[PDB]
Amino acid sequence: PATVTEQGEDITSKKDRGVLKIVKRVGNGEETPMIGDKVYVHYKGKLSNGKKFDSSHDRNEPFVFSLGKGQVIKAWDIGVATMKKGEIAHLLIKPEYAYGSAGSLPKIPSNATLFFEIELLDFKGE
């Protein structure tokens, strides 16, 4: 997470560093998911300080959602939108792009900075 702080690319339209990304593994894909595409990922998630660890692997199930429909935090609609199939991205997220000053307790404290390792398994339209 500190690495992303230093090295991570800004992928916010507004470029406020609210969302930062390192492409760790390059995908075989040439396409990215469109808004309204059903998205299939593996993911690991923690607060910046390593607390509240969560993963699709542990839940024995991929995390499936439709892109750009606010099913997930702003940071995910922005971040997975940049990703290619087979790609693994690292994300460091400002609370403004996650749960904000209100947070979401008990899991998400007030003004929490999140870290995600996401693997984009696939995406489909229709």
Active site residue 88: no
Question: Smallest Cα–Cα separation from 119: which of 63, 54, 59?
Answer: 63
CA distance 108 to 19: 17
Q: Which stretch binds ligand R3E (CB under 6 A): 6-14, 15-23, 28-36, 65-73?
A: 65-73
Q: Which stretch binds ligand R3E (CB under 6 A): 3-11, 13-21, 22-30, 39-47?
A: 39-47
Exposed/middle/buried for 90, CB within 10 Å: 0-12, 13-18, 19+? buried
Kindly report whether the peptide bond that precedes residue 62 is cis, defined as omega within 30 degrees of 0: no
CA distance 91 to 16: 14
The answer to whether 4 touches 25, Cβ cutoff 8 Å, is no
Q: Min. distance of Cβ 27 from ligand R3E in angstroms?
A: 19
Active site residue 108: no
Active site residue 73: yes
Based on the shown chain and the rule CB under 6 A, indicate whether residue 54 belongs to the binding site for ligand R3E.
Answer: yes
Considering only 11, 39, 67, 72, the residue that binds ligand R3E (CB under 6 A) is 72
CA distance 16 to 22: 16
Active site residue 77: no
Active site residue 43: yes
Residues from 89 through 118 that contact ligand R3E (CB under 6 A): 99, 104, 107-108, 114
**Toward ligand R3E, which CB reaches closer, 28 or 108?**
108
Extract the tokens encoding 55: 């993963």
Q: Which residue ranges make up the site for ligand R3E (CB under 6 A)?
A: 43, 45-47, 52, 54, 63, 70, 72-73, 76, 99, 104, 107-108, 114
